């Protein structure tokens, strides 16, 4: 019953190929609901989930006004960080930002987040107190000093404790049929000989939401962490996720192995084995 909202911003310079592209996407948990792309033929905030479509023109214009302003600001920020690292005008660079609020199962604010990165490295993050900053290096210390002067932390705390949580709760209600519905994994075990002496057992989980899941293999009831091949959880494209875990076992010790599945959608954790 825990929920979160996040916005993800990506600003990317591209010397010789026009001004830096800014893209913003918004999520509630693992469901994207809005996008804005400065490279679109006619840049505007666009809906990406059915339950946001009910918001009226003033919502779409407010979002668009904010993201357009961010497009210009991030372009200045990219020029500034270039300078802070004494970098040439020839290279492409990226600023990323991810911020938002986490609610507990009672709908109360658990914590807020606001983190930025430059070229994929931690640059500056708002501390959990929503009042002070952690800067990665002497370049980010400059940003920190600027942000302290414009009272940014104070502004973010007001948003994170206020509008962020209020809007997240609104979205949760408007999208309750999907956002507050956990779909359990559909599970099975496959067996494929690799040779005369060994076979792969692969434990599948399909059609689950949200993406959070634990899939493990045990041998005689102990975890097989080092010997388990475990793919990244992957989107199916219909809101659901997929995952598998594989172990190569001696033929025919198959029955000594059990696949264990934990997911929010499951009223009981699952133990599965290969069924010949």
């Amino acid at each position: 019953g825990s929920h979160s909202m996040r916005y993800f911003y990506t600003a990317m310079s591209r010397p010789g190929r026009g001004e830096p592209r800014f893209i913003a996407v918004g999520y509630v948990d693992d469901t994207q609901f809005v996008r804005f792309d400065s490279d679109a033929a006619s840049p505007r905030t666009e809906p990406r989930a059915p339950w946001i479509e009910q918001e009226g023109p003033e919502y779409w214009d407010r979002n668009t006004q904010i993201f357009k302003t961010n497009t210009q600001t991030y372009r200045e920020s990219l020029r500034n960080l270039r300078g802070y690292y004494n970098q040439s005008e020839a290279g492409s660079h990226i600023i990323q930002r991810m911020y938002g609020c986490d609610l507990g199962p009672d709908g109360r604010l658990l914590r807020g987040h606001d983190q930025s990165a430059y070229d994929g490295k931690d640059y500056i993050a708002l501390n959990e107190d929503l009042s002070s900053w952690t800067a990665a290096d002497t370049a980010a210390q400059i940003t920190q000093r600027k942000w302290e002067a414009a009272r940014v932390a104070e502004q973010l705390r007001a948003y994170l404790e206020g509008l962020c949580v209020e809007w997240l709760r609104r979205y949760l209600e408007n999208g309750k049929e999907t956002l507050q519905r956990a779909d359990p994994p559909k599970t099975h075990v496959t067996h494929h000989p690799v040779s005369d002496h060994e076979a792969t057992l692969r434990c599948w989980a399909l059609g689950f939401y949200p993406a959070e899941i634990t899939l493990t293999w045990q041998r005689d009831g102990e975890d097989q962490t080092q010997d388990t091949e475990l793919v990244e959880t992957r989107p199916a494209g219909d809101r659901t996720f997929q995952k598998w875990a594989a172990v190569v076992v001696p033929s025919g010790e198959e029955q000594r192995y059990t696949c264990h599945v934990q997911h929010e959608g499951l009223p009981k954790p699952l133990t599965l084995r290969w069924e010949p």
Binding site: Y7, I124, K146
Partner: peptide
Amino acid sequence: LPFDRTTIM
């Protein structure tokens, strides 16, 4: 809804 204040880094 997104945060409404821009601030240059």
